Design a protein around this nucleic acid. Structure first.
Lengths: 166, 100, 178, 232
RNA sequence: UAAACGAUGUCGACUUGGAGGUUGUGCCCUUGAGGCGUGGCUUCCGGAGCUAACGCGUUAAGUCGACCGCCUGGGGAGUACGGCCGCAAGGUUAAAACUCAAAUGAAUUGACGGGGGCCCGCACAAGCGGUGGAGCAUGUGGUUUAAUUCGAUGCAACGCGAAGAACCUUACCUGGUCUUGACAUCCACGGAAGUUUUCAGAGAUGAGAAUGUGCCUUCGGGAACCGUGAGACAGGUGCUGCAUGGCUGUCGUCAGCUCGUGUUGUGAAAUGUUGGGUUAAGUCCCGCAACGAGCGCAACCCUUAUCCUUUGUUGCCAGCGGUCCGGCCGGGAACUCAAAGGAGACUGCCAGUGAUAAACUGGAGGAAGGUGGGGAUGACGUCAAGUCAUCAUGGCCCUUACGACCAGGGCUACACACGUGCUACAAUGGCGCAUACAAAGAGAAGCGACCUCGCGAGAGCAAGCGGACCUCAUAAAGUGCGUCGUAGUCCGGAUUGGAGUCUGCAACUCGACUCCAUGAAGUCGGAAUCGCUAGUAAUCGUGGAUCAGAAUGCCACGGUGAAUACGU
């Protein structure tokens, strides 16, 4: 029954909660749906939507789905090495290189999602849909446009990426 | 429901004993068929004026453990609602559900 | 509806007979629930027919029970377009029971001095094709024999069937395509 | 919210009850009120310990109480004075010479009403009731029973409006009519008003209760197979 | 003008194809709008890549190019306003104060189609009978008074909470009468309570007589019943059912619902839990992301049916005795017979049907075949569904009272309508005479043989009883014969005069039963409308729950005991 990935650190970021209705066909039951984010400290594509009778059983379901069919991904230093504009499904987010002298600057549940992602110093404005369910894809799409450091000279910088497989 | 009829019934059993005991068949002895050529006259037809509340004909009981507006059941000392309630919890003995 | 087909049950015999045509005649002659009178009502009727002619006791009974007796019935069905009918062939068991029912309603209002005279005269009257349910048998069979030219919602059913595998003819159907 | 009649219409048809006595005629009413009274007043006196089932019984010339507990000898006291006092009041209420024995039920350390005590505390103190019913069912299924149903109602969590919620697990049939299965209805108040739990617990479908008797009583234990019967 | 469009500006370069429509042309057996070679517009299908979704995908909505057009929330507005063109209405780009927290692209599931199609409950049908019409029983409203108390309003109210209603009951209304109070504990005073007995007043309540002064003890003093009084406190059909707990009705025997968990989508959420075939069934063959398990359902269960089996009375009697030929009793065990172990029958077999198949129907022996007959038996749960009035209960009000003692009046009035059921309108029945067999159960303040009384019901006394012992009980319809013709009769027997009875001082309105004479409504009832598959339906009596007193009902029993189930 599946392989799972782990981090040596705890994430229990509950982002949303909902309830399921059929309203006449068996009427309406007490069930909830839930969305929970499991990072790594440097990032994961870990996002899980699950559902059950009660809120606790529901979140723990959703926390399980945030670590199966998912793998961890990694980025050196608290910044991102590319000024790129991550888009995922109308929720569009921005990054530009920065200092360590600034840490996070963000609010709500977003400051908690960016800390595990490693893209919190580079944190620039979000636009399009910025309600909780889709705003939180920073650590997914913003780590699939990824750049990360491996060179010793800027003029060997494109040469060094070519010889990584040649 | 409602305590005043339950209050009436509780007073009544000591008042049955006091008024009615000495005046049970006395109606019959002094007036009706037992008064065969004896009694039937005014000088004895004043003797029964105390019992009226004490009479078995006002001894309606209702639910012996709470009170209830009609629908009493004499074999349990209980009622419709209160029987079902006691049966849910298995407090009543010998109790089948009908199947034959 | 109905999850399954369900047939008739066993019916018990009566203390004066072992023949079925007699036991089924006393049964739908039963009213107030009391068959033990109806036993006599059947046998007292049959003796009066038998005095009218002595060849049999069954003379007028057997052809009345053919002649007032249907063969086909018509239901009315429509869920769109225009109004239609669907004829069905029915079981002997119900053909017979309409006929016996109609004989015992007609005879009990016939108003003669014995239930024995009333039934022998009402079977004598329908046997010769001039009693009271000859009209009812003739009208009901005419309507079922006639509405065989129609089918449930014909106008959309004629395209609907040939698209979903079916015939190009004109046929009656049980509340579906044709 | 139809709430099918959860146990009353299910008894005496190989399903034991919390009374076993014989009465008939017009005095059945005088024996039942007396049996309610002794049920109410006796368990209040042995309330020092928790208690799992109650059985009061009236055979020829005696009154016999069976009681079931999570540990034995505990309602019986020390010395023997404590239990002679339990027999004093059983005679006083029923009006017959008294007996009591101590016995335990199948799966003793678990019972219907001790789950509802556990769920009630959080609600009484107006804090931590959103995982409490679920943790109650988890503990309950770790201590025994083949299935449990819990339904909680109240002005729950101290709310200014009412809520129904429930929690069901394992195998708890509802048309069942064989083996005793243990039921409690709590009722209690706190500052905001009334709370309540309906606790059905299910031990076994042939485990626990009586079984159907496997013989007639007519051939057995009879040292002389006649009185006369014409054979002498 | 416009939905005036590769819906996608103009035109072009580049990016896995295959095929449709249909066409230049090379090649083919020209082998059917075809294939291959190489172009064509034009369309299906889907990969790299793209979208919020539909969808796009070599004709892009991909990768892009140059260069131009246009948008900055909605409504109000494609209008106003300005420039211009137009016989002439008009057209054209294109706005705000004001109003307002939205408006708007897409999609899930419920419901829903009157778009297409599929399924089920005695829900119809196939019938049969019943309410609705008469009259009565009983509840509802209308309407009425001091008041004729509510709760409930198709299916989800009306023989139901609130099953036995003179007062009591009991909410309602009026009259007396008191406030620790009918009831518990705690203090104070008078009477013991209990019983017998005269009387006043309405009865509450009190006075007097006669019997008794018990109970515990500091004989201080109190409990018990009753009166008196004070607090704490008892009590509250006290309000609020969007403040609640407990509890239950509905869909429906729908044939599905849910618990844990994975997966597909960004997700809401689905999937399973949906299809076909089959079923009481998540039962069973086939099968897709559903897997594992529970619920409904199946089961254990009590009961019946023959039949085995044991007991042998308060049960039975083939032969036998006492003998009027009755198990009453000497006696007998073949036998039912009662309550219980159960046996037997499993859709298991065979055949048809059915997609192979679950399973349905037929077939047969047998007491009995459709998961043998009967009953148990009903999911999660919306419905602000209904009870604060069994009962629990806060917020929160009275506590000389939204408590409590006592009498009388009323729901059950009567105008009618309405729910339900009862028994008639016939003759399958009624009558007259003669004639037959039950099952089950209720009786410890009770009923009850005999008794004397009684038109009958019943009456008071009492052996007796514990109900297979004794009694309700003559069980009736049915059966035998004769009789009756749609005439309110040969059906029905309401009203009313008048007598006799029950629980109780006390039966007048509000109560129940017996019986004598006369005698009406009612000809199978319209709109409406339901229950039922076989011990049912119909119909007749019986007992019981209830139960102070009494039934037309209900509940269960036994007599006599039906049509049919094609079809949706």
């Amino acid at each position: 029954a599946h392989i799972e990935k782990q981090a040596g650190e705890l994430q229990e970021k509950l982002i949303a909660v909902n309830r399921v209705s059929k309203t006449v066909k068996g009427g309406r039951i007490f069930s909830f749906t839930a969305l929970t984010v499991v990072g790594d400290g440097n990032g994961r594509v870990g996002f899980g939507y699950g559902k059950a009778r009660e809120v606790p059983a529901a979140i723990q379901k959703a926390m399980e789905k945030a670590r199966r069919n998912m793998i961890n991904v990694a980025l050196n230093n608290g910044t991102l090495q590319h000024p790129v504009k991550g888009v995922h499904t109308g929720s569009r987010v921005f990054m530009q290189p920065a200092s360590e002298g600034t840490g996070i600057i963000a609010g709500g549940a977003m400051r908690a999602v960016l800390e595990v992602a490693g893209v919190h110093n580079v944190l620039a404005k979000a636009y399009g849909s910025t309600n909780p369910i889709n705003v939180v894809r920073a650590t997914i799409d913003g780590l699939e446009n990824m750049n990360s450091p491996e060179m010793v000279a800027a003029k060997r910088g494109k040469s060094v990426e070519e010889i990584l497989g040649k | 429901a409602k305590q005043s009829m339950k209050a009436r019934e509780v007073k009544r059993v000591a008042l049955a004993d006091k008024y009615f005991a000495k005046r049970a068949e006395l109606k019959a002895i002094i007036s009706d068929v037992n008064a065969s050529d004896e009694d039937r006259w005014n000088a004895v037809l004043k003797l029964q004026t105390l019992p009226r509340d004490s009479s078995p004909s006002r001894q309606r009981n209702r639910c012996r453990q709470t009170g209830r507006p009609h629908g009493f059941l004499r074999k349990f000392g209980l009622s419709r609602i209160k029987v079902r309630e006691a049966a849910m919890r298995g407090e009543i003995p010998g109790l089948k559900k009908a199947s034959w | 509806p109905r999850r399954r087909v369900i047939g008739q049950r066993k019916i018990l015999p009566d203390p004066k007979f072992g023949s079925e045509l007699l036991a089924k005649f006393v049964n739908i002659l039963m009213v107030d629930g009391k068959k033990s009178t109806a036993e006599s009502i059947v046998y007292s009727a049959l003796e009066t027919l038998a005095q009218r002619s002595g060849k049999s006791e069954l003379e007028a009974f057997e052809v009345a029970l053919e002649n007032v007796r249907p063969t086909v019935e018509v239901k009315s069905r429509r869920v769109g377009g225009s109004t239609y009918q669907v004829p069905v062939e029915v079981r002997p068991v119900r053909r017979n029971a309409l006929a016996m029912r109609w004989i015992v309603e007609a005879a009990r209002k016939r108003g003669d001095k014995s239930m024995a005279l009333r039934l022998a005269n009402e079977l004598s009257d329908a046997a010769e094709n001039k009693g009271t349910a000859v009209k009812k048998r003739e009208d009901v069979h005419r309507m079922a024999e006639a509405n065989k030219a129609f089918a449930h919602y014909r106008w959309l059913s004629l395209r609907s069937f040939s698209h979903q595998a079916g015939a190009s003819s004109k046929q009656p159907a049980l509340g579906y395509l044709n | 919210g139809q709430k099918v009649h959860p146990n009353g219409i299910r008894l005496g048809i190989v399903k034991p009850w919390n009374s076993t006595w014989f009465a008939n005629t017009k005095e059945f009413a005088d024996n039942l009120d007396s049996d309610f009274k002794v049920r109410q007043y006796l368990t209040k006196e042995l309330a020092k310990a928790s208690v799992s089932r109650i059985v009061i019984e009236r055979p020829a010339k005696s009154i016999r109480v069976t009681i079931h507990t999570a540990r034995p000898g505990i309602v019986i006291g020390k010395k023997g004075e404590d239990v002679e006092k339990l027999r004093k009041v059983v005679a006083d209420i029923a009006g017959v010479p008294a007996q009591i024995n101590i016995a335990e039920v199948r799966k003793p350390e678990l019972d219907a009403k001790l789950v509802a005590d556990s769920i009630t505390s959080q609600l009484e103190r107006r804090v931590m009731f959103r995982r409490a019913m679920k943790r109650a069912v988890q503990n309950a299924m770790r201590l025994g029973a083949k299935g449990i149903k819990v339904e909680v109602s109240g002005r729950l969590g101290g709310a200014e409006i009412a809520r129904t919620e429930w929690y069901r697990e394992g195998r708890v049939p509802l048309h069942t009519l064989r083996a005793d299965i243990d039921y409690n209805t709590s009722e209690a108040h706190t500052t905001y008003g009334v709370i309540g739990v309906k606790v059905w617990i299910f031990k076994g479908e042939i485990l626990g209760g009586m079984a159907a008797v496997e013989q007639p009583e007519k051939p057995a234990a009879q040292p002389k197979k006649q009185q006369r019967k014409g054979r002498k």
